[PDB]
Amino acid sequence: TISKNNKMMAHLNYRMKIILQDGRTFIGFFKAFDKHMNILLAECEEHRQIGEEKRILGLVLVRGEHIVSMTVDGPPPRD
Amino acid sequence: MTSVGVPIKILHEAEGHMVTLETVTGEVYRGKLSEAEDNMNCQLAETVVTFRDGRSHQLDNVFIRGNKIRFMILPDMLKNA
Amino acid sequence: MSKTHPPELKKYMDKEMDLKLNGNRRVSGILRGFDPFMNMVIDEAVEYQKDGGSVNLGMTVIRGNSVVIMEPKERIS
Amino acid sequence: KRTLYVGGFTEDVTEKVLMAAFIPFGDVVAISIPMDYESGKHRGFGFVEFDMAEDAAMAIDNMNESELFGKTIRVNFAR
Amino acid sequence: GPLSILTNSVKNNHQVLINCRNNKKLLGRVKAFDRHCNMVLENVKEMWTEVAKDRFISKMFLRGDSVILVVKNPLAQAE
Amino acid sequence: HTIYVNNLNEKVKKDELKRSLHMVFTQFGEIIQLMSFRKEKMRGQAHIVFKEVSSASNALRALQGFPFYGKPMRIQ
Amino acid sequence: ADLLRNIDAHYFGYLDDEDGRLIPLEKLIEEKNIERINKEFAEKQESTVIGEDGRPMTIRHVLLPTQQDIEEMLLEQKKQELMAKYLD
Amino acid sequence: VRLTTELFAERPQFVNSVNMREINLRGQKIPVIENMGVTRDQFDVIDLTDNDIRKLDNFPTFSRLNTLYLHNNRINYIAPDIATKLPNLKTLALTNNNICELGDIEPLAECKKLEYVTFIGNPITHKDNYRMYMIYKLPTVRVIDFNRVRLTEREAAKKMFK
Amino acid sequence: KLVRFLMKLSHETVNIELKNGTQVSGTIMGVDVAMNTHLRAVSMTVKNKEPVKLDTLSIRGNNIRYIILPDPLALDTLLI
Amino acid sequence: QPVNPKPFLNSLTGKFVVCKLKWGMEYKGVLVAVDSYMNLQLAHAEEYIDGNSQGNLGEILIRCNNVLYVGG
Amino acid sequence: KEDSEQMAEESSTLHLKEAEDYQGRSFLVPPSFTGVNLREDYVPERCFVPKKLVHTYRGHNKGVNFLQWFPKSAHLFLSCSMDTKIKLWEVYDRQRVVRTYAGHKLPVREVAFNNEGTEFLSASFDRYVKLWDTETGQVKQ
Amino acid sequence: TMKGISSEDVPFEEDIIRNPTSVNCWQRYIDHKLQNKSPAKQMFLIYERALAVFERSYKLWYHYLKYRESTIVNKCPTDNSWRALCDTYERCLMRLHKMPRIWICYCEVMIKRGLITETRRVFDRA
Amino acid sequence: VQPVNLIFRYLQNRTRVQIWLYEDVTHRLEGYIIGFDEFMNVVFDEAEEVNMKTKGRNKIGRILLKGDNITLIHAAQQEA
């Protein structure tokens, strides 16, 4: 996925999960790629641990500098 | 010719609407965006800052340097594409 | 390719603004300085301390990379 | 890239006709046709802005030299 | 230059003792070089206080951006 | 649209004055432009800007002599 | 340009299909591909008309409800939930 | 004219002299407040002055809203649940309306964070116990009808009601 | 050249340490020089947290504090 | 007139200097170094913290970013 | 010609429309239509190969015969012509218009600013130097 | 079954009847479903209904054809579901035969089926 | 005005300036300056460092301070 162009295209139409520098976790689709690792994250939800909390979010573009870990799962989307 | 800057093209599309961003100091900003640079330096017109406890403040202008910051969130309108 | 030029800093210069420093220190100052390194030069500035009183800052030099946070008091027209 | 220069259309081609010719390759959100005030007619050229540069590439590669009203219309990158 | 120490230390097959900014110490033999002092560590023993804990690592690779401080022990025995 | 105001009541706080006049002027019309100060020489004076000449006269006649913080304000 | 004086009836393929001996050879390569994709995957109305090029093709026209067949279905549905909400 | 979702886009959305974020819906022939939810509480100030609003009700739940201006409207009823909709409302000016009863202030009194109000021009000023009732019901309020509350009036007010 | 080791390092199983005292174990499957790290058949162990298993993982290599390498890997041939 | 750091260092080169790290640790060492990153190298170094000696050290490798002092 | 003759003859005229843009700031010293450095040093880097002509500046009827630079910048240059007019020009790959100065009975030969820069003195074959204010566009010495 | 309505498409399906001539009403109908991963037979129907009204809309044809290819991707190219995809391209081309993207995609789809004898003929038509 | 020329004005008059350090650091420096370059490297002389843990001062003679480590520079004032 990261940087390499061909990996980006293969991973599309999958559900993708992100873990960041502040320990919060995000899950979002992407159909954009910058080889310097900038992607557009859509239809995202975040989970917070105090306890536990969930929040509804707006659409996001992500900078690779903050991402600590990323994993891919889930059923294919539409289109 | 030019062939570079796909997020910047999206960043240009993100201009004129409202953006959310976080800083290395840990607080969150919400602001309307119309400035972009190749070195990722950016400036926001109209801005609100809110802390993760209960403090919030309003800022009329904020300038952001692209090399000592956490990343910004772009408007939903980009889903037009 | 093409790239881009520096912003129109002249539109905002010579106004009075507050500057913020790491560790929640506050400075209030008038600004008139610019360079390609984007350093800053401040004059007639005052500091507001978190654990004491106040001190006056006389003609200040700032390395551009460290601090750039502004809240302005004069609305742009 | 997202801004196209459009050229070579016949005097019959109005802005909606270009709208009908360019949304074939992506979302078009505006077209403009500068009109020559001395003749009271257009100069045979118009601009198209796309929401995506990829769409503009599928609109240059597949509209440039395409036939409209039997004339080869030219679509190109605004310099 | 500073590489003089690296070259002479490496050329004499020495080990390096490393101490970290907070919790951990490392001991290693070296085979990597660049202007950024990236290192590959061999015959590694990891010890840190979370009670005393001990773990042995045969081979390790250390990047030069997460940089840590080096201590020399010449009376220690060679391999 | 510029007027000079003098001899205002000294007890109104800066934001309170800004807030008090803002509620006063917004009821009269869609006018929101004011600058007020509270330092020793600056006290008792403020600068206000009107959107239109017609709204200014109605507001001026109403504010002329209106009791505010126990004192009748005057406008020139 | 200068290609336009060279485009002709041969370019559009009007003069290249009287032979037809290609089809048996194409069939041979075609079936090996079918088995090849099967092996790679193993581990993982109508109408008939003379088509564009003169050869028969089949068109699978969709049959689907028009708006008049479905604006009435939602109508009956919404009246039931409105009366249910009025009583309950 | 109607307060539909399209009206919110066409009308000005602007930042006021106190750096708060305001949307303009003044005088838009609004008879009943509705469809405000499309804003999704993104505005600090809502200005509905000069409209034809007949009742103060149907507000969505807003928490960012600091100041609301409703001068000169036609409000003749206030919903009791207004405190649940606008709990964080700090300024509410209802000047020149026709609010007639202390009971109308009770929904407004449930808004426990309301601090500044104006009721000049309302008939309620003539009503008996108009001044003393507010002092008892609203101890957190700092300014009323462009007037302050004396410390002695609370002692006098407490003496009257006790 | 050092660039060869990052590109050649693949298919083996490694243990990874992250700045937050966090431990990861994953096998590598990638062919590129830019140090982009992609893992398969992964187990995850965050500091002061229970172990969890992951089917695939990708990590920004610059964030990684240090990577622990398997016993038979003769690192010398990959570095040249 | 003022002097650039490199000729300034030349007068200082080989002499005795005080060092401190951004993390709050202090060191004393002999220095010979010139490089584009402006790194430092110390040999046979004696260690002081809060002015009190802890240990005598050997050869040490330290990145330029964390070190910020040189003077005597 | 003398002051009484030259004033009735309209020897200087104003034609600029963009005298202000977003602020009432000066337009000669700062390059207000640019984001580049407002004041510049003498040497940024080691020299490089030249490139291309921007435009011919077509419109005027006669030849050009001296060039001078503005203090601390290269965005704006001043030109002297045998047509007895003095004009300013923008050079950073731009083609916008600037205001015209004129007042000489014979061709201009040389120009020097005063060190403050708001005035310039011009030498002409008519044996006079006239004093212009660049912002005002008028003569009075 | 071919019949059925739900509380969450009552609004969108009604909106299309009062607004019979705006593509965006079908987009508002489609788009929320798109988020909501839900049966393809419903999605094919909503697309074919939209493509019955606005038969020259490239966007809906392109997105529909790519969506058919997207969901059928799990079936082996020998399957009749890939034949049905090709029959959808033929119906698309009855309107959009002057857009190379439709022809280019159609050719790539024939290549993914591995056929040759009339993959060539699709190219000859294009 | 710009920092390099202003540093020339400080050093020519030998003004005493205060410098602070960035990231996770807690130290204050009070000193006179005699050094210049376009890279804003600083030669610090006749300096005194304040220890914020104790509000004590130590006197320091001639040190070099790298410009990238430097935050703000301004003419020092008393703190107690």
Curated annotation (Swiss-Prot), chain C:
GO MF annotation list: RNA binding
Keywords tagged on the record: Cytoplasm, mRNA processing, mRNA splicing, Nucleus, Ribonucleoprotein, RNA-binding, Spliceosome
Protein name (record): Probable small nuclear ribonucleoprotein G
Known partners and oligomeric status: Core component of the spliceosomal U1, U2, U4 and U5 small nuclear ribonucleoproteins (snRNPs), the building blocks of the spliceosome.
Keyword RNA-binding: yes
GO cellular component, one term: U2 snRNP
Subcellular localization, as worded in the UniProt entry: Cytoplasm, Cytosol; Nucleus
Family: Belongs to the snRNP Sm proteins family.
Chain ranges of the Sm domain: 4-76
Function: Plays a role in pre-mRNA splicing as a core component of the spliceosomal U1, U2, U4 and U5 small nuclear ribonucleoproteins (snRNPs), the building blocks of the spliceosome.
Keyword Cell division on entry: no
PROSITE patterns the record matches: SM (PS52002)
Cysteines engaged in disulfide bonds, as pairs: none
GO biological process, one term: mRNA splicing, via spliceosome
Gene3D superfamilies membership: 2.30.30.100
One Pfam family named in its UniProt record: LSM
Listed transmembrane segments: none
Underlying gene: snr-7
Main location: cytoplasm
Curated annotation (Swiss-Prot), chain E:
Domain of life: Eukaryota
Keywords tagged on the record: Cytoplasm, mRNA processing, mRNA splicing, Nucleus, Ribonucleoprotein, Spliceosome
Keyword NAD included in the entry's annotation: no
Subcellular location: Nucleus; Cytoplasm, Cytosol
Example of a GO MF term: RNA binding
Domain Sm: 3-76
Major location category of this protein: nucleus
GO CC terms of this entry: catalytic step 2 spliceosome; cytosol; pICln-Sm protein complex; precatalytic spliceosome; U1 snRNP; U2 snRNP; U4/U6 x U5 tri-snRNP complex; U5 snRNP
GO biological process: spliceosomal snRNP assembly
Function, as annotated: Plays a role in pre-mRNA splicing as a core component of the spliceosomal U1, U2, U4 and U5 small nuclear ribonucleoproteins (snRNPs), the building blocks of the spliceosome.
Family, similarity comment: Belongs to the snRNP core protein family.
Protein name, entry field: Probable small nuclear ribonucleoprotein Sm D2
Organism of derivation: Caenorhabditis elegans
Portion of the full sequence shown: 27 to 118 of 118
From Swiss-Prot, chain G:
Coiled-coil residue windows: 25-44
Compartment(s): Nucleus
Tissues in which the protein is found: Ubiquitously expressed.
Gene disruption phenotype: RNAi-mediated knockdown results in up-regulation of the transcription factor zip-10 and its downstream target asp-17.
Function: Regulates the processing of the mir-60 microRNA (miRNA), which in turn negatively regulates the expression of the transcription factor zip-10. Does not affect the splicing of zip-10.
Protein family membership: Belongs to the ISY1 family.
Name of the protein described by the UniProt record: Protein isy-1
Species this protein is from: Caenorhabditis elegans
Entire protein: shown range: 151 to 267 of 267
From Swiss-Prot, chain J:
Keyword match Nucleus: yes
Any one GO BP annotation for this protein: mRNA splicing, via spliceosome
Sm domain boundaries: 4-72
GO molecular function, one term: RNA binding
Location in or out of the cell: Nucleus; Cytoplasm, Cytosol
GO cellular component entries: catalytic step 2 spliceosome; cytosol; pICln-Sm protein complex; U1 snRNP
Principal subcellular localization: nucleus
Alphabetical UniProt keywords: Cytoplasm, mRNA processing, mRNA splicing, Nucleus, Ribonucleoprotein, RNA-binding, Spliceosome
Protein's job: Plays a role in pre-mRNA splicing as a core component of the spliceosomal U1, U2, U4 and U5 small nuclear ribonucleoproteins (snRNPs), the building blocks of the spliceosome.
Family to which the UniProt record says this protein belongs: Belongs to the snRNP Sm proteins family. SmF/LSm6 subfamily.
Name of this protein: Probable small nuclear ribonucleoprotein F
Natural source organism: Caenorhabditis elegans
Full-length numbering of the shown residues: 5 to 76 of 85
